[PDB]
Amino acid sequence: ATDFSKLSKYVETLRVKPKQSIDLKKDFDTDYDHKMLTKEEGEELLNLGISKLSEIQEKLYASGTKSVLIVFQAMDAAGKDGTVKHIMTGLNPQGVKVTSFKVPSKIELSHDYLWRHYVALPATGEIGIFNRSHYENVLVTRVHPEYLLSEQTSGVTAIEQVNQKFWDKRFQQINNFEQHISENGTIVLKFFLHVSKKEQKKRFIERIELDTKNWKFSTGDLKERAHWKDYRNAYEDMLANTSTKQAPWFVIPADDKWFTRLLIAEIICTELEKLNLTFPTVSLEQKAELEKAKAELVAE
């Protein structure tokens, strides 16, 4: 009945189940038109979600036991960078690291495609946010197989060699990677921000018309949009083969940003709450030390 219980219920429908097939036009909304709360209420609940998340982070850091890896993927202008900024703003910098994986360096191209991601994994007690991730290697690379030609370790000397079997094998490799880290103390949560083609267009135009922001918009941004369908295919096949119970994907409607952020904060808090984190407790010995310390201070 409660608005929070409505949200909690709705959130469980966003998890990609391991056995399901994925049609992003039909099975998953870019916009939710049955919202259980107003924007204003959503904004106030998001702030609580960020505070709860900061509390969890501090308990995680003080514990130094599990690590947390949060992956974000999205089409351009879905609101991924803003979502990451908004979260980061409310967390302590000491225990939290954002890595944005760009075009690989020459050195990175001299290792397997997973190496730079493995290198950047979170240490125990830390939270690692991959803003773009290892998944780029079954997404941007799949839409533009020509990139595989610069990958010395990938074994591809001509794009005609690349077929469904090449992608199936990357999905297995990615799954093995995430299972391993999951079996060795890392909680893995993956978010695809799902924005409609129409809303992407409206965001592109809005930016182009802002004399304050339009220095940021290139011709290349259109080019990736012209591959909308190829990206959708790549995303579908990936979500259908790399969401496990242990490392789930969540598809988040991205067309209303406040709602996107709310949902992501909720899911992260919900999932991390299963860890039952608590702050350190003060033992009798420690209590005696405190009382002694305070006595000495007062005695000065």
Ligand SMILES: O=P(O)(O)C(Nc1cc(Cl)cc(Cl)c1)P(=O)(O)O
């Ligand atoms: O990652 P975000 O989606 O937040 C991205 N926003 C954005 C906006 C426009 Cl109108 C065009 C393009 Cl190509 C991107 P950013 O500029 O915040 O990184």
